Amino acid sequence: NNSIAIPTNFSISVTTEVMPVSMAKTSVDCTMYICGDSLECSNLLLQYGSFCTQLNRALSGIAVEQDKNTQEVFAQVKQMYKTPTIRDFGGFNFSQILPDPLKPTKRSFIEDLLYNKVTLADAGFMKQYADCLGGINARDLICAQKFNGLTVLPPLLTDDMIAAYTAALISGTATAGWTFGAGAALQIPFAMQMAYRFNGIGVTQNVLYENQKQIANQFNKAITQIQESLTTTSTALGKLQDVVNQNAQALNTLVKQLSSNFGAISSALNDILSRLDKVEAEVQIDRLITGRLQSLQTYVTQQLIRAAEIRTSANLAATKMSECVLGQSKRVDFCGKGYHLMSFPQSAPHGVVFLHVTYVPSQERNFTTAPAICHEGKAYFPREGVFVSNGSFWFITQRNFYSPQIITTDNTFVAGSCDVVIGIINNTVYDPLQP
Amino acid sequence: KFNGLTVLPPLLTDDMIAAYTAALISGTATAGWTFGAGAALQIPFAMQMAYRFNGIGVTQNVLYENQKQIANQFNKAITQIQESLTTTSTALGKLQDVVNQNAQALNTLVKQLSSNFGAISSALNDILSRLDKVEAEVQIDRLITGRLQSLQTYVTQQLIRAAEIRTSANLAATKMSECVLGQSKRVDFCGKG
Amino acid sequence: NNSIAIPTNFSISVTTEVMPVSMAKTSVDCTMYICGDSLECSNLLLQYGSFCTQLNRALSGIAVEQDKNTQEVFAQVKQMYKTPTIRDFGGFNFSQI
Amino acid sequence: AVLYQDVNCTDVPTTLHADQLAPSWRVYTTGPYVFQTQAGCLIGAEHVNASYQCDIPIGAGICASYHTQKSIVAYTMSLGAENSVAYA
Ligand SMILES: *[C@@H]1O[C@H](CO)[C@@H](O[C@@H]2O[C@H](CO)[C@@H](O)[C@H](O)[C@H]2NC(C)=O)[C@H](O)[C@H]1NC(C)=O
Ligand SMILES: *[C@@H]1O[C@H](CO)[C@@H](O[C@@H]2O[C@H](CO)[C@@H](O)[C@H](O)[C@H]2NC(C)=O)[C@H](O)[C@H]1NC(C)=O
Ligand SMILES: *[C@@H]1O[C@H](CO)[C@@H](O[C@@H]2O[C@H](CO)[C@@H](O)[C@H](O)[C@H]2NC(C)=O)[C@H](O)[C@H]1NC(C)=O
Ligand SMILES: *[C@@H]1O[C@H](CO)[C@@H](O[C@@H]2O[C@H](CO)[C@@H](O)[C@H](O)[C@H]2NC(C)=O)[C@H](O)[C@H]1NC(C)=O
Ligand SMILES: *[C@@H]1O[C@H](CO)[C@@H](O)[C@H](O)[C@H]1NC(C)=O
Ligand SMILES: *[C@@H]1O[C@H](CO)[C@@H](O)[C@H](O)[C@H]1NC(C)=O
Ligand SMILES: *[C@@H]1O[C@H](CO)[C@@H](O)[C@H](O)[C@H]1NC(C)=O
Ligand SMILES: *[C@@H]1O[C@H](CO)[C@@H](O)[C@H](O)[C@H]1NC(C)=O
Ligand SMILES: *[C@@H]1O[C@H](CO)[C@@H](O)[C@H](O)[C@H]1NC(C)=O
């Protein structure tokens, strides 16, 4: 009942958070999947003609929404701030977060490391139609998907525009701070921004200016540690990989489901129309059509459910960008484990990777405390901080750093009569006015 | 179980969940709000409640002059909460509905096996023991195509229910992270006041 | 324009909030449900063989999710603080929880 | 205007079989109004060097519109106004 632990040192930690934003936009042609380029089948599909656009009114409703998830996340600023020529903002090294002007690439080092980790060459994201016509490439899965009228529409924003958005966001964070989300950007030196961000945690601003070099070294070491950890590992972006794998396996299942005959005598339209006359060939083709509509229906339903899940993740990403980047958040364990300082967004294939910078106290110490001190019959309570004892003296400190101060009347406020407070002690309060 | 519809057990038992709950409550009581950031820091409960009072707008001299009244009010509120869970009968209706929906869906999936889907019978034994193999394949395939639809509908409805349960689980995780491991300033998020 | 109401007393209230977290995980066997333990039916189900694993890739996708929904809610601490031997934390009674 | 998915502008009439098409279709397989994007050959709209907002999105950072006789133009979408902040 009279013991308290007060930290004496701290640490700065940079953590990763990977969230998907969008999936692959897909379009489906009813003809060349149900009726394989045959005139006899296309004369029978018209009776099901209202059952097809209902698919194309759904798959085209997801895809435009897939271009709304990205621009809600990244395009949160109406100004494109240019990247500064320097990367040393008072000891804080921003070299590997911002793009390098002396390189042909428009993406930074960590952005380059996030790429070439997601194997995008498993689906039909980049596949020309020239090599699909001839050669052994006709045995590929993508060639069959294209020959069966299943394409993948390209995204609106390229990777260069998203990289420019992230570079503008990081430049606005470095040169302006929290004030470029409200109105016009207001310049401020980065040490003052760090001091103000420290003052919103419970640590007074004199702590930063007495430990600027140590904090700069810790930040640089943490950035170098997270940068090296993205090369040795093999599984760190499994969330973004699962989306590509799921879409590719769903399209492959939809392609491979054409080998089922659905109760007919054959699974192809060519050996049915070349064996049976038109009297009884219409009762086997219709079974195939009614069976091949169900595969498209199931694919559309599963795509809609996955689109809803991806939209939920994109809304969470947009909220995290609006709250944990453009300002400082007081929500516990929202961005990063601990006391949040600031965050940096990095692009990834169909996803966003957040680097959260967090403050954690490290080394504790036992202490004996007291709820209040009464001097001459009147109780004194601490204004900001707690009363503490080092063994022989009584001081008043802050709750997140051991910085002892002499108990005066400028840091205490008076109340009570010390007959009602439980645990009150006897001590003297220094008066700074004596002639 | 005779139709191949089983329910798998959960990974976490009730004892482990109760241990997690007891650990969270003990960490809140002894350490406070500081065990969700880093290492747990001990502090007396009176000073912790004084600091939590200071986050509202009420100064900390109010609690130390009224500690017994606040303690008695908290104890009476806890007692009134405990007795209100014995007399009532409809207070966990959400979880009861969650259980009942799954049970009713599985029962409906079992009972949907009595439809012949246009065939001459709803069972595979009086179809294969009357008609020869020439014309029995046109009736069994109707039953198979009919019985795939029931599984498809069941899987789709289970997916939708799983999506809404995942949304509620994310809300519960946010409530546990923001209100148990600290004190939130969001109006009407956890509590009323 | 010159009147204000200020409280003079307070009260401490406890409010319960119930929330579902997980539901019942389910597995479905294709061959037992569709074909009533008969060899003639199972010889025709093979042509529908791609339609069944797609079912078992969905329900099994739900169940492994339901073991996560719990661990996101309750498993938010990496340390097991033992319950103290006392239940009187400065007058506040913790004996029920 | 007509956009072909993932083809080259030289191979448009070969992969569309322009000999068997209608005479009105053959004007959309070649001509002076040909643009090459990362999504494929866009035939029907002229390309301009200006940058505006997006009206009809195509893909790979290309947006078409109906500007001034009037005709369909194509360009690259503008992300925003370029700005600079003096830091010291
Ligand atoms: C907190 O810990 C850091 C190390 O994480 C200490 O930083 C050292 O400070 C001394 C001078 O005080 C320097 O000579 C060292 O180079 C610093 N680094 C290391 C790695 O030792 C810091 O002093 C600690 N603060 C305390 C104990 O109050
Ligand atoms: C703290 O100081 C007060 C005020 O002096 C003490 O209360 C009385 O002190 C006088 C001497 O000043 C003693 O003769 C009385 O016996 C004290 N009365 C009581 C009821 O204690 C008080 O004892 C001091 N110590 C503490 C722990 O409160
Ligand atoms: C606020 O209301 C409570 C009752 O809800 C009052 O508490 C009483 O306080 C007196 C001393 O002030 C004690 O002797 C009583 O035992 C308390 N309880 C009851 C049930 O009477 C409290 O005084 C009120 N505060 C005000 C009016 O300022
Ligand atoms: C004074 O404030 C202005 C406006 O906030 C700053 O902005 C512009 O800076 C550029 C580059 O130096 C100048 O060419 C412009 O004339 C400035 N004004 C406007 C309205 O565009 C300016 O940098 C600030 N002054 C200094 C010396 O930093
Ligand atoms: C910042 O980091 C880069 C890359 O590691 C390094 O070359 C440079 O010396 C560091 N410091 C400054 C002040 O740019
Ligand atoms: C703290 O608790 C101990 C053990 O019960 C007791 O002796 C002591 O008086 C208490 N101190 C205060 C200030 O309540
Ligand atoms: C706390 O509540 C329990 C259960 O009603 C009771 O037995 C006990 O006396 C109360 N007080 C203390 C100080 O434990
Ligand atoms: C199509 O054009 C691109 C870009 O010029 C070129 O790299 C590619 O080789 C061309 N394809 C063919 C088949 O000529
Ligand atoms: C548009 O830009 C291209 C590429 O630089 C150039 O060849 C062309 O002349 C420009 N057209 C104009 C300015 O009308």
DSSP string, B27-95: HHHHT-STTTTSS-----HHHHHHHHHHTTT--THHHHHSHHHHHHHHHHHHHHHHHHHHH-S-S-HHH
- Taking residue C82's Cβ as centre, other Cβ atoms within 10 Å add up to 9
Phi, psi of B51 (to 5 degrees): -65, -40
Report the relative pairing of strands D71-76 and A4-5 from DSSP bridges: unpaired
**Residue pairs between chains B and C whose CB atoms are closer than 8 Å:** 208
B47 touches chain C (CB under 8 A): no
Tokens of A387: 């009363």
Ligand in closest contact with the CA of C87: 7
Phi, psi of B5 (to 5 degrees): -125, 95
Distance (Å, whole) CA A335 – CA A343 = 8
Residue of A nearest to C77 (CA): A337
Strands (E), C1-97: 26-28, 88-89, 92-93
Quote helix, strand, coil % in chain D, to nearest 5: 10, 30, 60
Q: CA torsion, points B145, B148, B153, B159, in degrees to nearest 10?
A: -150
- Taking residue C2's Cβ as centre, other Cβ atoms within 10 Å add up to 3
Nearest to C91 by CA among A5, B66, B97, A302: B66
Q: In what order do the strands lie in the sheet with D62-67?
A: D46-47, D71-76, D62-67, D56-57
Amino acid, single-letter form, for residue A418: C
Helices B133-175 and C50-73, axial angle in degrees (round to 10): 20
Distance (Å, whole) CA B162 – CA B168 = 10
Ligand in closest contact with the CA of D76: 9
| Residue B176 DSSP label | I
Helical (H) or strand (E) element with D56: strand D56-57
Cα first-last separation, chain A: 41
Question: What does each C-alpha distance from A146 to A120, A303, A375, D84 come to in angstroms?
Answer: 18, 19, 87, 46
Distance (Å, whole) CA A288 – CA A361 = 67
Q: Which residues of A touch C50 (CB under 8 A)?
A: 253, 256-257, 259-260
What residues pair up with D63 in beta bridges, in sequence order? D57, D75
A266 neighbors A258 (Cβ within 8 angstroms): no
CA of A423 to the centre of ligand 6 (A): 8
Helices A50-73 and A282-324, axial angle in degrees (round to 10): 20
- Taking residue B20's Cβ as centre, other Cβ atoms within 10 Å add up to 19
A29 touches chain D (CB under 8 A): no
Helices A238-256 and A282-324, axial angle in degrees (round to 10): 170
Report the relative pairing of strands A373-374 and A379-382 from DSSP bridges: antiparallel
Report the relative pairing of strands A351-361 and A339-348 from DSSP bridges: antiparallel
Nearest to D3 by CA among D49, D51, D35, D46: D35
Distance (Å, whole) CA A251 – CA A46 = 25
In the three-class reduction of DSSP (H, G, I as helix; E, B as strand; rest coil), residue A405 is classed as strand
Distance (Å, whole) CA A394 – CA B73 = 34
For tokens 């009884």, the residue is: A280
- Taking residue A99's Cβ as centre, other Cβ atoms within 10 Å add up to 19
B61 neighbors A379 (Cβ within 8 angstroms): yes
Q: Minimal Cα–Cα distance from A323 to chain B, Å?
A: 14
In the three-class reduction of DSSP (H, G, I as helix; E, B as strand; rest coil), residue A53 is classed as helix
Supply the Cα-derived Rg of chain D in whole angstroms: 17
Nearest to A71 by CA among A27, A2, A22, A138: A22
Do chains A and C touch by CB distance (3+ pairs < 8 Å)?
yes
Do chains B and D touch by CB distance (3+ pairs < 8 Å)?
no
Residue of C nearest to A333 (CA): C76
Q: What is the DSSP string of A281-332?
A: SHHHHHHHHHHHHHHHHHHHHHHHHHHHHHHHHHHHHHHHHHHHTSS---ST
| Other chains touching C, judged by 3 or more CB pairs under 8 Å | A, B
For tokens 């290309």, the residue is: D62
How far from chain centre, in Å, is Cα D85?
Answer: 35
What residues pair up with A408 in beta bridges, in sequence order? A430
Binding-site residues, ligand 7, Cβ < 6 A: C 87-88, 93, 95
Report the relative pairing of strands A92-93 and A88-89 from DSSP bridges: antiparallel
In the three-class reduction of DSSP (H, G, I as helix; E, B as strand; rest coil), residue A249 is classed as helix
In the three-class reduction of DSSP (H, G, I as helix; E, B as strand; rest coil), residue A252 is classed as helix
- The number of CA neighbours under 13 Å toward the Cβ of A233 is 14
